[PDB]
């Protein structure tokens, strides 16, 4: 009509015709899709416990050494964008720019201990309509891998995409409809005389190749509204 | 298998956005509120600043649209029948004559492209190409403006897009007409390089990258604290 | 060389390339036609039961003597395989017990990991009999002892007679592996189904016993973590059943 | 497997066979014809500037937070490359930063070695600006801090915001490498020349910043040497200039 | 295919506008799960996400077309079921049959006189 849709692509007359643009040169690192920024790993703040968030201690998962053998290392609700563990990483900063999302999440746990240390962890994953495991025996009968840190230093754990519908809303909280990734002590942490007994795990989350987003909007993080000065 | 066209760089950085709302009168008094002025910078609006600051180097044309709605001021000496309001919107190309006030020769300069628009029809639109000596605009500049590390830390860079000045063309004696301009800026043919992390700290001013130390994420009860467990 | 093993859409175990022991020389297999006596078809649950059931880790301390699990009671609560032990009457299954330790290079010790078919055990009191509560727990290990046990209905849990009245060094006759912390780290034994009948009821019968006995005791200096976790992982093989009914009990 | 690298008739560096990171996917190269705007020829000093400039070693202690060098100011006094920064007007160069540590097998820790193009940094006081003396020293590192810096014209050197106001875990977006002392020992990043102009004056502009941040802190027992030396070695690549004149200053 | 027929009038009483320029109206379609205006002059109106039409009085009416917007593969006139999980909630009202809202206001800043559309 004779209206102005703000979401309407139209050519306009150039204000400065007869002007030659500077010839574009080859700059390395061209981006064509926002999903290429989400498919890189970013360090996941798993230890966000209100006295670590203002330090580097909210990136290090503590694995103490001694006699536990039945307790938990960590655990979180597997939903990027709304969970505090994931909403500030590169994947969960791009998901907050969109209202729908669909795809897999790839986790990677790196054991940052000494080469003389040896142990075993049970990395369990629970499905979306399922309760978090409460002990190591319940987590064993679910979906688990055994990460023997004497043999491998990283444990890549890819998480499947299970939903009734095609996409999934980012800003909503369907409790008990996302999945949990917990980790349990299996053996402990065995060190020789001279090695430090306690250690550190780091987690890295990214997207996969089947990832997609839809329905762009404004990020919840920026609250400022008035112009700067 | 889904489609990834919603998160391309063109579909993510090309939406029109109201970046500047000003008002300008049509009768005398101080020689400042008779016109409007906007130096074209993508730093005063935080929402668009954060999307542009996911990249180091950008290259785009501009697509600026002006939504001008006027009104009749109250008080005595009202115009009754007033013909129609015509407005001049002038784009001062970077390094071009800039109006000190209304009715200045800068307005009648041939060099500065201008649009004469009459009220009651479709809004005024103009397109500006990539205007830089360099080969891209830079959202960041780790460096200085002058030679011997003297000057402001990245503000006199060749990232100048120009100004936009708007005034009434009419010579209206009786009655005042107050117009309000809305600028809907939009980039076209965006090409972006060197992806940067999204900002955590809030902004303080549109000349810096200054910040206050903020937490990396939001707190939780324990390391093994999944939430709610409805069942 | 750090090859991952995925068995079913739940399990991941990471392991290097090492040596296996295959049974008495046979791989586990499915029952053929001229091997059974039952009047029906097996209907094996291959689509759901073949995964890794990683049990809880035991702590090999300096003064520990040995541990045993009785099978198939060791997977009584472990998931869907425990449900098939409820809602069936007969069963037949091989297993792939994988045992591995996490020690440093400054630890030393040696384990013997045996699978003993029909490891019937004597009681700690002569002229008396054992109870089922002293033979095995459902998922946790049962400890051997250095000294003499002296209970009324318990098991003679002295370590050098292995609970069976034999020499403990002669348990090398059955399928076995040595975890020597100097050179070896892991042990993996593939047990077939051994019985005198083609299918038995897997509540009353204990098919085999997995014993883990330290022959050279664990030593370490004062810097070291004062235990080595031993992690056992059982994966059933070619499990097939008969006699669909309700659970008893329960 | 211990192959030596000789670059120019002065330098020898010994290194094993490991992984490299090549830029944003491009190798450094020389400027072609349809890429420049200057009115002259480059006259690249290939015969004298391509060698290894091994900077001084920093000590990774238990309580250290991180270090950064700004480039190309990090080679301001380093030999003939520092002379070319004096006696020229424009310059264009890629680099091959090689970072390696000398730790034992009884040490533990993890580093993140980033090359951040256009790492513009905010000040420790809002409504104020930095000076050039607080952005970088000429050859020594600048330390991040655990707590909040509070100066007037300094840099906000808190470690989890990386001096740029971002999340420190998201610096993995730029070319990077992880030195994990359990498995990795060295890190080598090949940075190309990234700018919006084909050639810039390399006194005012900082092309990139090399940050080395420990994510898992260094732990050791009481026998051990209580630091790990981190040695950085920068080798320029395809350096070419324009504008021969005197040195200013001096 | 939604079409808006907007006719305005001049309100009676004192302080009348005499000559008033022209009335421009903003019609905003809030896509399902989009910012919804609490009142007039709210940032929701200036949100880029919610598609809007600026229409001037005296010409052809304003028209917009909205596609099939649902996570599901159809809308359902009936829903024999519940909204939440354990048979709790309203009997078929929070279903994915949401088409959005439509909000209309005057763009003008009219001080003297009221115009009722």
Author numbering:
A (entry chain 3): 10 to 238
B (entry chain 1): 56 to 286
C (entry chain 2), D (entry chain 2): 81 to 330
E (entry chain 1): 118 to 234
Give verbatim excerpts from the published study on this entry:
Cryo-electron microscopic (cryo-EM) structures of the three types of particles: F-particle (~ 64%), EC-particle (~ 3%), and EE-particle (~ 33%) were reconstructed to 3.2 Å, 3.8 Å, and 3.1 Å resolution, respectively. By contrast, the EE-particle exhibits a typical expanded form with a ~ 4.5% increase in diameter (~ 340 Å) and notable perforations at the icosahedral two-fold axes. Superimposition of the asymmetric units (protomers) verifies the similarity in capsid structures of the F- and EC-particles and reveals substantially conformational differences between F- and EE-particles in several exposed loops, such as VP1 BC, DE, EF and HI loops, VP3 EF and GH loops. Remarkably, most of these loops are key determinants for immunogenicity in HEVs, indicating that EC-particle, rather than EE-particle, has more potential as candidates for the development of a vaccine. Incorporation of EE-particles in the vaccine would require a rational strategy to facilitate the structural transition from the expanded to the compact state. Notably, VP1 C-terminus, appearing to be the most divergent in sequence among the four subgroups in HEV-Bs, is largely disordered in the native virus structures (F-, EC-, and EE-particles), indicative of a cryptic immunogenic site, akin to the VP1 GH loop in foot-and-mouth disease virus (FMDV).
